[PDB]
Amino acid sequence: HMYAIGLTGGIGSGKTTVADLFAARGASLVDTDLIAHRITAPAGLAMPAIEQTFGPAFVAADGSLDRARMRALIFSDEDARRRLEAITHPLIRAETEREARDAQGPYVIFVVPLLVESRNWKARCDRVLVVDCPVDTQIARVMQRNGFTREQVEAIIARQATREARLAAADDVIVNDAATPDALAVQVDALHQRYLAFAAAK
Amino acid sequence: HHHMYAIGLTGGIGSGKTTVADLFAARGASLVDTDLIAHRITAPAGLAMPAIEQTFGPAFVAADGSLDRARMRALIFSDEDARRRLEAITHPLIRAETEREARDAQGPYVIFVVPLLVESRNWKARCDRVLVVDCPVDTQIARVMQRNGFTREQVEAIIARQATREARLAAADDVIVNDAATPDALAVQVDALHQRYLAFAAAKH
Ligand SMILES: [Cl-]
Numbered sequence: 001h002m003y004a005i006g007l008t009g010g011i012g013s014g015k016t017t018v019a020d021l022f023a024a025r026g027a028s029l030v031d032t033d034l035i036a037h038r039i040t041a042p043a044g045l046a047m048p049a050i051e052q053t054f055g056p057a058f059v060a061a062d063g064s065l066d067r068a069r070m071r072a073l074i075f076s077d078e079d080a081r082r083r084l085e086a087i088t089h090p091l092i093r094a095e096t097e098r099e100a101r102d103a104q105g106p107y108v109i110f111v112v113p114l115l116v117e118s119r120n121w122k123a124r125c126d127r128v129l130v131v132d133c134p135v136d137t138q139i140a141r142v143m144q145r146n147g148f149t150r151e152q153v154e155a156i157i158a159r160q161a162t163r164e165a166r167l168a169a170a171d172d173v174i175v176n177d178a179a180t181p182d183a184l185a186v187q188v189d190a191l192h193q194r195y196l197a198f199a200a201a202k
Numbered sequence: 203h204h205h206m207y208a209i210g211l212t213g214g215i216g217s218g219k220t221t222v223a224d225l226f227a228a229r230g231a232s233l234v235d236t237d238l239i240a241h242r243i244t245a246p247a248g249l250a251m252p253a254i255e256q257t258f259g260p261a262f263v264a265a266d267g268s269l270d271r272a273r274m275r276a277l278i279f280s281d282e283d284a285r286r287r288l289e290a291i292t293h294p295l296i297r298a299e300t301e302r303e304a305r306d307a308q309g310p311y312v313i314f315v316v317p318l319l320v321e322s323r324n325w326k327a328r329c330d331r332v333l334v335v336d337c338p339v340d341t342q343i344a345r346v347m348q349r350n351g352f353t354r355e356q357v358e359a360i361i362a363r364q365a366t367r368e369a370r371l372a373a374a375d376d377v378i379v380n381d382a383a384t385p386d387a388l389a390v391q392v393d394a395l396h397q398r399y400l401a402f403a404a405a406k407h
Contacts, residue, residue, distance in 0.1 A: 001252045045301055048206050053327045063204070086324050090294035091301065097249040120290060123257050 002028075002100060003107040003199035006125035008115035008166070011156050012138030013131045014176040019111050021188040027195070028103035031111040035095045036088055040065035045095075049087045054080075075152055093120075107199040116169040117161050126202065129191070130170035133177045135163065206304060207311040207403035210329030212319035214367065215360045216342030217335045218380040223315050225392040231399070232307035235315040239299045240292060244269035249299070253291045258284075279356060297324060311403040320365050320373040330402065333395065334374040337381040339367060 007022075009015045016031070023029040039046040042064045051059050054073075060066045074081035100108050115121045115128060122128065135157065142153045160166075167173060174187050211226075213219045220235075227233045243250040246267035255263050258277075264270045278285035304312050319325045319332060326332065339361065346357045371377060378391045 001255065045305065048304065049301060049328060051205070052208070052330075083327070090298040093294055094249055094298035094302075097252065097295070100252070101247060101249070120253070124253050 002103055003195070003202050004100065004125050005107065005109045005127045005129055005172075005195060006115045006121060007109050007111045007129045007131065008113060009131035009133070009176075010135070010138050010160050010163070010166070011113065011153070012141035013133045014141065015111055015113075015131050017181070018129075018131050018174055018176060018184060018188065019109060021185055022109055022192060025188065025192045026105050027192065028100075028105035028108040029111065030096050030099045030103070030108060032092050032096060033111065033113065035092050035099075039088060039091050039095070040067070046088050046091055050084070053083055053087065071152075075155060107195055114160070116166050122169075126198065127171040127195075128169060129172040129174065130166050132163070132167055132170075132173055132175050137177050203305070203307070205406045206307075207399065207406045208304070208329050209311060209313045209399060210319050210325055210332045211313050211315045211335065212317065212332065212370070213335035213337075213380075214339075214342050214364050214370065215317065215357065216344075216346035217337050218345070219315055219317075219335050221385070222333075222335045222378055222380060222388060222392065223313060225389055226313050226396060229392070229396045230309050231396065232304075232309035232312045233315065234300055234303045234307070234312055236296050236300060237315065237317070239296050239303065243292065243295050243299060244271075250292050250295050254288070257287060257291065279359065311399050318364065320370050326373075330406070331375040331399075332373060333376040333378065334370050336367065336371060336374075336377055336379050341381050 007015060007019055019029055019031065038044055040050070042062045044064065047059065047063060047065065050065060054070070058066050058069050058073075070084065074084055096110060100110075109129075110121070110125065112118075112121050115125070116130075138157065139150060139153050142148060142156075143150065148156075161169075172191055174184065174191075176184060209231075211219060211223055213222075223233050223235065242248060244254070248268070251263065251267065251269070254269060258274070262270050262273050262277075274288065278288055300314060304314070313333075314325070314329065316322075316325055319329075320334075342361065343354065343357055346352050346360075347354060352360075365373075376395055378388065378395075380388060
């Protein structure tokens with residue numbers, strides 16, 4: 001089976017920016033966040049089980065997840081968050097394996113937010129790349145996007161590994177704080193060459 | 203298919219879950235047997251095989267790319283940590299693939315055949331009702347030995363891992379006692395539940 005790099009980092013680290021640079025160089029990319037979105041979209045795989053556990057209040061009239069209603073719940077109620085992840089996480093794993101099985105590139109990258117926090121994701125990957133950046137930058141980036149309160153964002157951050165812990169568990173690191181896109185590309189270029197070599201040797 | 207009605211069918215090892223399941227399927231219920239999914243995902247190219255290989259090593263991967271079930275069985279019965287690490291891979295994948303199979307089901311309701319049902323908060327939440335196929339432990343022991351060729355001690359170890367008979371029965375919504383019952387006798391109970399399940403399914407829609 002195909003050589004796999006886990007790409008992780010805290011929320012707001014710019015994982016997608018870096019992931020997209022690897023995809024442009026030929027890496028196959030599996031983004032677990034995108035899968036999570038897909039499976040809760042209209043006719044998404046997770047929807048029958050979500051309806052079963054949470055009921056029709058969380059199913060919009062197009063058949064998709066009512067994301068605002070779910071967001072309000074899971075941020076107020078840790079049992080709820082846990083019940084939700086118990087549905088979506090297994091599906092993410094399966095879809096991840098499906099896509100990896102079909103991947104055509106010389107190696108595959110799994111973009112996974114809670115990677116170093118997971119015995120299973122660490123075991124699954126051949127290497128771990130951490131896209132690192134300071135917490136105040138992470139918060140600024142998330143607030144630019146979907147504007148959670150600093151409160152949802154700080155809650156999400158509190159559930160993540162510490163910065164120091166994630167960095168100590170990396171095999172590779174890219175710091176994406178004030179880096180320009182040109183600067184990130186220099187770093188991805190070299191890692192891409194090294195990843196081609198690791199993959200040819202396995 | 204919207205608002206799928208789902209029955210969880212369970213019972214201890216040797217209770218004859220498969221006999222009852224097959225009766226439902228002959229009446230038009232869609233069956234999703236999680237044991238078959240377990241086998242599927244440990245076949246060549248099966249979804250569990252990379253994690254199995256990343257975690258246990260290629261000695262547990264047969265020539266065709268499938269799980270070496272003989273080697274794996276030796277390990278997991280002798281080492282409880284090893285069993286838990288296997289299941290940490292297969293169990294989420296089984297639960298996931300169950301959804302995919304259930305989505306394609308064409309019958310009026312789905313029955314999930316699940317050994318470790320009442321033991322699982324996930325499965326309980328997932329099912330509209332739980333059906334327990336029940337019998338004495340003595341009957342379980344005998345059947346499992348005489349037909350699967352398990353050693354007594356493997357059965358008892360499975361029996362020791364699984365919920366008690368009493369706890370299983372107390373968590374049931376429906377019960378079929380399958381001890382000395384003939385096929386015809388089981389079919390009578392099944393015909394009645396099937397009608398009731400059709401009505402539940404129709405209401406849920
Ligand atoms: Cl499979």
